[PDB]
Design a protein around this nucleic acid. Sequence first.
DNA 1: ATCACAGGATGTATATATCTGACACGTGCCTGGAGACTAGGGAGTAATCCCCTTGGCGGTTAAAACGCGGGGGACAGCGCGTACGTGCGTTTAAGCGGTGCTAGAGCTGTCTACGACCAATTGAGCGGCCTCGGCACCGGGATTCTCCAGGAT
Length: 54
Amino acid sequence: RAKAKSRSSRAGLQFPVGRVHRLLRKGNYAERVGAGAPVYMAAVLEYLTAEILE
DNA sequence: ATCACAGGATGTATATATCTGACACGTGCCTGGAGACTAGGGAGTAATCCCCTTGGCGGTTAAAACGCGGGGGACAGCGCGTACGTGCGTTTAAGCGGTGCTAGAGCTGTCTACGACCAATTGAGCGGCCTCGGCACCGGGATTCTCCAGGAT
């Protein structure tokens, strides 16, 4: 049994990834969401967040 | 000097006849709509808890309302001159039609890596709690604005 590990850490991100994946698959955006979509998106939201805050 | 009218010139709308290709209708599929069936999760209902909206009171205070005087902008009127509009004649390449080539859209069939799904485990994040520190406000002083008088242009 591997230890549970936050994806944000894995991706080197501060924004949550599992949650983004979760949001993407529902809200009825699509029947299915690919593994790399949540990750790509989390990076984008984080990037923009940084620009405004900076 | 201005009004209107009549004539000409021009451009528009009108009826007419003919042409053609874009619609209206019919045929033959064929695959998506409709009927029939079960299974189970979402929506509906009521309980009820308590948070937050409503209404009311009294002070106190800044903010609105009102009035007056006077400068400054909005507006109308005038005249200059030039930058556009209109019409003519020459030049351009747009549009039409047809030809020929093949690059890439669109569809078929096969196979497999990917994600939905489900059950188990747990730690990342949310609610509630205390603590005190950055921000808002007070009062005083510094200096940085605007505006008028008087002396230049």
